[PDB]
Write the structure tokens for this entry.
Amino acid sequence: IWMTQSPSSLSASVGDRVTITCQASQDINNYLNWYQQKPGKAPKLLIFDASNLETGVPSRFSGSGSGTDFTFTISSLQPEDIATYYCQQYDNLPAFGGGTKVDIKR
Amino acid sequence: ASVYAWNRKRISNCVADYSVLYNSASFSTFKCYGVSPTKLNDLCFTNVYADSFVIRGDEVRQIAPGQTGKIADYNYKLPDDFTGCVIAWNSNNLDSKVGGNYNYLYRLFRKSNLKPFERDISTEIYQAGSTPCNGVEGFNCYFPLQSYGFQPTNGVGYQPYRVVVLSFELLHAPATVCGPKKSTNLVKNKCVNFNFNGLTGTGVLTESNKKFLPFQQFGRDIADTTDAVRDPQTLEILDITPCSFGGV
Amino acid sequence: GNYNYLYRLFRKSNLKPFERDISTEIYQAGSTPCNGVEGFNCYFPLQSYG
Amino acid sequence: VQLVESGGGLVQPGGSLRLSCAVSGFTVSRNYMSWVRQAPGKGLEWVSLIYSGGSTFYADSVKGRFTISRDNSKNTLYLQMNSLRAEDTAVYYCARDLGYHDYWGQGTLVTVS
Amino acid sequence: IRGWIFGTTLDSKTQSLLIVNNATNVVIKVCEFQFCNDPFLGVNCTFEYVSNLREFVFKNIDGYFKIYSKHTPINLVRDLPQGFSALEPLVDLPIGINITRFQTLLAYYVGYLQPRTFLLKYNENGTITDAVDCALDPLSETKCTLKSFTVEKGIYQTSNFRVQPTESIVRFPNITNLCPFGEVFNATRF
Ligand SMILES: *[C@@H]1O[C@H](CO)[C@@H](O)[C@H](O)[C@H]1NC(C)=O
Ligand SMILES: *[C@@H]1O[C@H](CO)[C@@H](O)[C@H](O)[C@H]1NC(C)=O
């Protein structure tokens, strides 16, 4: 199962609604997690099981999707959300996505 | 049953027509270790055990001797010297639901791997850290079971599969599970090598004149020689006249 | 893992003394003729040692 | 709650190195514990996992060369690396697996050249 | 009389045969039943089957429970009738449960089998019409050594009589010290 994460880079502004897409080569039910990683820092778990926001993560991050197409939704981007985001297939071979870098729009 | 709570059925005192299994096209996995299912029709066993459960396709490989993983370690484990058969078939049409069937569970945490044929159904809160949980979930305190997500649109690896493991057990007791052991037609007035219920010989079978009792099977002459037999299917008594011979 | 060493796993009858069989005929494990095509119940008689 | 890993260093190809991961607030032997690495400028790659029951598993790129283990008395996870290659150069994190990993260490840097 | 219980403990600790004829239905079970102290009737199962003077023979050989039976009319109260009759086989259970003790479920009579040699007379119709116990008396010994229910006058050699020992004598020298095997197997150097 191949995880295709798109786009590689996306530019957004503070307060925007951001949509990151992770595409699996076939149906993986809801077995997907999302991570956030900032330069020089360890990854941070945001959502597990495709639609369970991890405790303490702000309400902005919203996860949804089922089957073969999954999305991470940041309802209101804040300054500390510019980072790289990774999807990971769960209950399998821990395959990771290529990552999406969210950068400052200008 | 769920894999963590795999059901076991004991088969005893019957005829096991294994052909119905190994001639069936309804099974995608049929792998027997240490035994050929064709030869099972010629063998008897004290007991047979059918361990039935449901997993996902990618986990089917874990149902085999010397295998590791979630299912092998925490749900169902086969011995390294396992003798018997493993049968598995897709059950997407039966165990999947459009909204997702979560009735099937698997054990996600356990303090140690299962021993062969061990069954663990406890719902104890799993203590992942050094703080005792005392039955209360929280940080480092997790439920040991998790539901499968079975939808009809799931990939074949994630689709449900029903698995039955047949194991054979011989004890210090009579073997009561036996194969078919079919028979053939019988011919009279011709020299035949015959094998009735438990006895074998050579001779000519002829219509008899005796009146065997309802419970008598094998005749006997004065000099401890088989004389007549009761045909197991037809309630007729056959005299055994040994085939002609003599000096030249 | 060296798999260059093989062993025959199926045969229609037991070998006679000092008999040597190197044939690669497909063993028909079921009632369906194989016609030289491997598959379900149609096996290559040899298997490699691990 | 913190994961404190150490042992990364510069080493020649074919060399050996053991990484240690001291845990606090979590019992390594009671958890799914993994090593995950990140090559310079690349994404995350899962390396190895040890089950609570003791079973271990490895990514294909490291199979036969890396060994994961743990010490209960020291509450510490280990990654023993042998026959290191240039492509093993990465920051190595140890993480607790709930595949969804919630607790990460700060990472230790391995350079093979 | 209604049925029988066979087993070793018969207290739900090990399998035990239970045979009961409930008034139209014969039922045989081998479950690990929990029995009462006095299991009377109102005035893990490995097998289950469902279907004046009466005689039965129960025995257990090589895991097989043989049950032979015979029925006959009678006009007598105070004792068994004198006469001869053979018992046919009815059941051969492959149960495999070893029995040590048994109990009845309701006047009756109980006897215990012994490994004896018998001479049986089969008539033209295959049925036993008479028997001779080969160890009952000298005449019966002669009958079973000649293999004929009637023996004509004469003197026949049947067996050999030998006295039996009355006491067992064991003699050995009086030595106390243990053999120093330890110094050889536990020797520091070999
Ligand atoms: C056995 O089955 C055959 C038919 O297959 C039948 O004709 C015959 O009566 C049966 N015998 C007994 C003893 O039931
Ligand atoms: C043996 O049975 C036949 C009929 O089956 C009968 O005519 C005969 O009288 C019987 N023999 C005796 C001694 O009663």
About this structure: Residues B 211; E 123, 125 surround 2-acetamido-2-deoxy-beta-D-glucopyranose (ligand 2) (CB under 6 Å). The interface with chain B takes residues 1, 25-27, 30-31, 51-55, 57, 75, 98 of chain D (CB under 8 Å). The CA atoms of residues 53 and 79 of chain D lie 18 Å apart.
